[PDB]
């Protein structure tokens, strides 16, 4: 996990186009018509982790190996969803514990453009200031979504610095990043916020919420995977 067959080229509003297939775990969550409403991350061949607020259902589909959503010829994998596991602790009022697992009907065929991201340990500590990356097909300007997958490097923020803006809205299962010239935006939800752990890309956050105008000087808020990974492991173990 966490090692793309195709290396990404570093250096979402104000982000940049990603090298095709360089973020193999990124999936597009779409309705039966092909309409992209959220992103997601493959954690293995049969499971996808996304945000709880995305409201995924078994009627929706997981699209893996995609880069250009405007290309009808591009080879991709349209995977059906067998069951949806929304974290029962998801708070629809505070948006805390914003995570959902998707169990595929048919396993994804891993390849050069389709593979899994690594999951962290509940005790992992990704220092504030650490430069991580987020990806997705969300708006690049706050309008329709970009056809090609975007990426952006951004720093993790300490809870103290995040609260300087969001105050008590920041809960324990949330981690902030950004306010650095880039921002996740409409359509990025459920997607990954990854940081390197021993060189391997590991899921530290899940795009959740933030500025209502996708301001690049405001902290972005993500579901803190370290606070939710035990729930993830348990769910996989029981299913």
């Amino acid at each position: 996990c966490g090692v793309p067959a195709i290396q990404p080229v570093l250096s979402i509003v104000n982000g940049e186009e990603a090298v095709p297939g360089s973020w193999p775990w990124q999936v597009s969550l779409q309705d039966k018509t092909g309409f992209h409403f959220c992103g997601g991350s493959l954690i293995n061949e049969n499971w996808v982790v996304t945000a709880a607020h995305c409201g995924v259902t078994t009627s929706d589909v997981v699209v893996a190996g995609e880069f250009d959503q405007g290309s009808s010829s591009e080879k991709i994998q349209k995977l059906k969803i067998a069951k949806v596991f929304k974290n029962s602790k998801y708070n629809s009022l505070t948006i805390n514990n914003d995570i959902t697992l998707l169990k595929l009907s048919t396993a994804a065929s891993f390849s050069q453009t389709v593979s899994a991201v690594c999951l962290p340990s509940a005790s992992d500590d990704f220092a504030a200031g650490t430069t991580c990356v987020t990806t997705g097909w969300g708006l690049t300007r706050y309008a329709n979504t970009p056809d090609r997958l975007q990426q952006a490097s951004l720093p993790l923020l300490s809870n103290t610095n995040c609260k300087k803006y969001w105050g008590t809205k920041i809960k324990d299962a949330m981690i902030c990043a950004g306010a650095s010239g880039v921002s996740s935006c409409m359509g990025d939800s459920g997607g990954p916020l990854v940081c390197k752990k021993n060189g391997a890309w590991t899921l530290v956050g899940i795009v959740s919420w933030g500025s209502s105008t996708c301001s690049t000087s405001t902290p972005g808020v993500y579901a803190r995977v370290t606070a939710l990974v035990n729930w993830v492991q348990q769910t996989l173990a029981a299913n």
């Binding site: 607020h53 995305c54 009022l93 359509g187 459920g190 919420w209």
Partner: protein, 58 residues
């Protein structure tokens, strides 16, 4: 009809791209808008039919 029917559509702070319907009193019909996935207001419906049954004529 409920006054919430007269409120403009509310996307919310979450970053999803979910199609929902809201009643547009100016035009007299329910229109689509993009909902962010959380903290929806009442003028937010999953189908045009639900929206018209709740806000039609406001």
């Amino acid at each position: 009809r409920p006054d919430f029917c007269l409120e403009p559509p509310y996307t919310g702070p979450c970053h999803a791209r979910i199609i929902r319907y809201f009643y547009n009193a100016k035009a007299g019909l329910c229109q689509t808008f993009v909902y962010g996935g959380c903290r929806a207001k009442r003028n937010n419906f999953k189908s045009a039919e639900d929206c018209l049954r709740t806000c039609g004529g406001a």
